[PDB]
Amino acid sequence: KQYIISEELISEGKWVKLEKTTYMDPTGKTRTWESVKRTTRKQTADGVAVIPVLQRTLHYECIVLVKQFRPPMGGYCIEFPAGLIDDGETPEAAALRELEEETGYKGDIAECSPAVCMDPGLSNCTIHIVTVTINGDDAENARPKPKPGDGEFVEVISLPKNDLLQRLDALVAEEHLTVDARVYSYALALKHAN
Amino acid sequence: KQYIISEELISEGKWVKLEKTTYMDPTGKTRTWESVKRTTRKEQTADGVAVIPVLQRTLHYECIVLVKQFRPPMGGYCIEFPAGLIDDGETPEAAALRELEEETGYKGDIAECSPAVCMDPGLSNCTIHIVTVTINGDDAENARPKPKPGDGEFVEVISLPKNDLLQRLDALVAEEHLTVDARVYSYALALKHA
Ligand SMILES: Cc1n[nH]c(C)c1S(=O)(=O)N(C)C
Ligand SMILES: Cc1n[nH]c(C)c1S(=O)(=O)N(C)C
Ligand SMILES: [Cl-]
Ligand SMILES: [Mg+2]
Ligand SMILES: [Mg+2]
Ligand SMILES: [Mg+2]
Ligand SMILES: [Mg+2]
C-alpha cells in the first residue's frame, strides 16, 4: 500500500544528510517526512554492534560494554562495542575487528542478525547485531590489547550477565551516564525471561 | 575529560536539525562531529517512549505485542515496540500507556519505566524511556481491542509468544521484505540467551 515517491536533499554534510521524503499513505494521500541518512553506506548495513559474552571459568559470565564521549549526546554513553562496516568487509569480520579495537578481546562468532533498524522514525540507519563469545581463559585474552583508531577513546566496562539491568541502573545513578537503548533492552529481557 | 565547546546549526527542518558540534577530545585537542537533533524537544526527560507490552492471559503463553508500520526513512515496513513522542507536560508513563492504546487498542498497566536511553548516540541526541507494561488480556476492556490511529498513522498489531520470539521474528523476515527494530531484536536475543 505504502511506498516512496521521491526524496529531496535538504542538506548534505560530510557525514550526515537530511532529506524530505515524499510518500504515499495507504489512503492514496501524498505525505512528506524528514529523514536522515549517513553518506558512508555502500553494505548489508551501516554498522555492527557486538554482544560480547565474556566466559571465564569459575566467574560470572559478563557482557562487555564500552563507555565513550558521544558528541551528539554531549555526554558519556554506555554501549555494545560497535562500529561501521568497512567497504567490502563482512558483518562478522567487522564485529571481531571492532571488538578487538574497542576492547582488546578476541572472540568467536556465535550468531549474526539480519540488518536491524536503529531509529526508523528518523533514519535509515541499520546494524547487524553479532553475538560473540570471548574465551577469557585463553592466553590471547589475558591482558586484552585495545587498538583504537584515530580519535577513539574507549573505556571498557564488563558487567555480570545475570544482574546486568541492576548493574546498569547503579551506573546511571552514580555516574551521570546514558545507557544505550539496545543495551537496556537486552538487559530488560534477561530479567523478563521465564 | 571531554565536553562540548559549541554547537553550530547546519540546517533546520520542521522536525529535524543537523548541527556541527565542536568538542574537546581527551588529548586536549578540539575536534568536530555532525549531530542530528529533533526540533521540538522541550522540557521532556526524553523525546519519546517505547513500550514493552506483555500480554498476559490465563492458559496462554505470554505474548510481546509489536507493531508493523511504514517508515518513510527506511523506505519500507518495520516491526517495532509500540512507541511515540512524549507530548509537552506528559509523563513517560502516560505517554507509554496512551501510545500503546492508540497503536494497539490495548489498555495496559505500568510495570516499570527506564531512565532516558539513547537511540543512536554516534548520530543523534535522541532518547526514549523504555516502559514495560503488562496487559491483562482476560479483562473485557482488552477483549476486542480497537486501535485509534492518529492522523497519518497506520499500524498493524503483531503479538508473538515471548517463549519463541526470536524464531518468530526470523520467520516473519524470511516471509516478506521488512526490517526488525534493533531494540526488538536485542530483546528477543536476550530471551534466547538467558
Ligand atoms: C513528521 C516527521 N518527519 N520526521 C520525523 C522525525 C517526524 S515525526 O513525526 O516522527 N516527528 C515530528 C519527530
Ligand atoms: C564523524 C561523524 N560525525 N557524525 C557522524 C554521523 C559521523 S561518522 O562519519 O562516524 N558516520 C557517518 C557514522
Ligand atoms: Cl551466548
Ligand atoms: Mg565504536
Ligand atoms: Mg572502533
Ligand atoms: Mg508510534
Ligand atoms: Mg503514535
UniProtKB/Swiss-Prot annotation, chain B:
Binding-site list for Mg(2+) 1: A83, E103
Induction summary: Overexpressed in cancer patients with a poor outcome.
Protein residues bound to Mg(2+) 2: E99
Tissue specificity remark: Widely expressed. Most abundant in liver.
One Gene Ontology cellular component: extracellular exosome
Mutagenesis or variant effect for E153Q: Reduces catalytic rate 120-fold
UniProt remark on cofactor binding: Binds 3 Mg(2+) ions per subunit.
Compartment(s) where it occurs, according to its Swiss-Prot or TrEMBL record: Nucleus
SUPFAM superfamilies, sorted: Nudix
UniProt PTM comment: Phosphorylation at Thr-32 is required for homodimer stability; dephosphorylation results in destabilization of the homodimer. Dephosphorylation at Thr-32 promotes the ATP-synthesis activity.
Main localization category: nucleus
Cofactors (names): Mg(2+)
Positions bearing Phosphotyrosine: Y61
UniProt similarity note: Belongs to the Nudix hydrolase family.
Entries under PANTHER family matching the protein: ADP-SUGAR PYROPHOSPHATASE, UDP/ADP-SUGAR PYROPHOSPHATASE
Stated name of the protein: ADP-sugar pyrophosphatase
Organism per entry: Homo sapiens
